[PDB]
Design a protein around this ligand. Structure first.
Ligand SMILES: NC(=O)C1=CN([C@@H]2O[C@H](COP(=O)(O)OP(=O)(O)OC[C@H]3O[C@@H](n4cnc5c(N)ncnc54)[C@H](OP(=O)(O)O)[C@@H]3O)[C@@H](O)[C@H]2O)C=CC1
Ligand SMILES: Cc1c(Sc2ccc(F)c(F)c2F)sc2nc(N)nc(N)c12
Length: 186
C-alpha cells in the first residue's frame, strides 16, 4: 500500500457541497482531473482505493458509480452492507485503513484517496503521518452547506509543482480554478 492522499475541490469560502451536489455548475475537466488523479496507479497491475462517506457516495451520479478502475469503499455506521455498486463498507477511517493491511487488500492497493466529505477529510488531515492534499481552488464564492476543514499551513506546505498536475489557471463555464498540492509529514 503506497501513499495516503485527500482530494477536494473547494470554493473561496471553503465550500465543497450544497444540497447534495457541488456548489458550482459541473466543470467536466475538473471531474476529469479527479478521475485521472484518483485512477492512475504508479505500480502497474495494482489499483487505487477511494474512501468516501455515505453522502458523497450518493452524490455521485449513478452512471459514474462505482468510480471505475478503483476500489470503492464507503464509510457508514448505519449501513449493514456496501451500497449497490460499491465494494467495501467500513465503519471508521481507522477500519478502512486497517482493512488495507489485510492480505487480500495489501498487495492489490497502490494509493489510498480520501475523496470526501468533511468529517473524513478532517480526521485524515489531523492525523499524524505523511499526507498530501490535492486541492482545486475554485476561484470564487459559492453558496455552500458543507465545508472543507482548515488547512494548517504551518504543517501543510504548498508545493511549487507536481508531476501530472497543471499548474496554471484554468477556466470552464466562466469559472476560474487552479490545481494545488499540499504535503505534510508529521
Ligand atoms: N467539492 C468536492 O471535492 C466534494 C464535494 N462533495 C459534496 O460534499 C458533500 C459531502 O457531504 P458530507 O456531508 O460531508 O458527507 P460524507 O460523504 O462525509 O457522508 C457523511 C456520512 O458518511 C458516514 N461517514 C462520514 N465519515 C465517516 C467515518 N469516518 N466513519 C463512518 N461513517 C462516516 C456517516 O454516515 P452514517 O450516518 O450512515 O454513519 C455520515 O453521516 C455533498 O454535497 C457532496 O456532493 C463530497 C466530496 C467532495
Ligand atoms: C468526489 C469528487 C467529485 S464526484 C462528484 C460529483 C457530484 C457531486 F455532487 C459530488 C462529487 F463529489 S468531483 C471532485 N473533484 C475534486 N477535486 N475532488 C473530489 N473529491 C471530487
Amino acid at each position: 500500500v503506497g501513499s495516503l492522499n485527500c482530494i477536494v475541490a473547494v470554493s473561496q469560502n471553503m465550500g465543497i457541497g450544497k444540497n447534495g451536489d457541488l456548489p458550482w455548475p459541473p466543470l467536466r475537466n475538473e471531474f476529469r482531473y479527479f478521475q485521472r488523479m484518483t485512477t492512475t496507479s504508479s505500480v502497474e497491475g495494482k489499483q487505487n482505493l477511494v474512501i468516501m462517506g455515505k453522502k458523497t457516495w450518493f452524490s455521485i451520479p449513478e452512471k459514474n458509480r462505482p468510480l471505475k478502475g478503483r476500489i470503492n469503499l464507503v464509510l457508514s455506521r448505519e449501513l449493514k452492507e456496501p451500497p449497490q455498486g460499491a465494494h467495501f463498507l467500513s465503519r471508521s477511517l481507522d477500519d478502512a485503513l486497517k482493512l488495507t493491511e489485510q492480505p487480500e487488500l495489501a498487495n492489490k492497493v497502490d494509493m489510498v484517496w480520501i475523496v470526501g466529505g468533511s468529517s473524513v477529510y478532517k480526521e485524515a488531515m489531523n492525523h499524524p503521518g505523511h499526507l498530501k492534499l490535492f486541492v482545486t481552488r475554485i476561484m470564487q464564492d459559492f453558496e455552500s452547506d458543507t465545508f472543507f476543514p482548515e488547512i494548517d499551513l504551518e504543517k501543510y506546505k504548498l508545493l511549487p509543482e507536481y508531476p501530472g498536475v497543471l499548474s496554471d489557471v484554468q477556466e470552464e463555464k466562466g469559472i476560474k480554478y487552479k490545481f494545488e498540492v499540499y504535503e505534510k509529514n508529521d
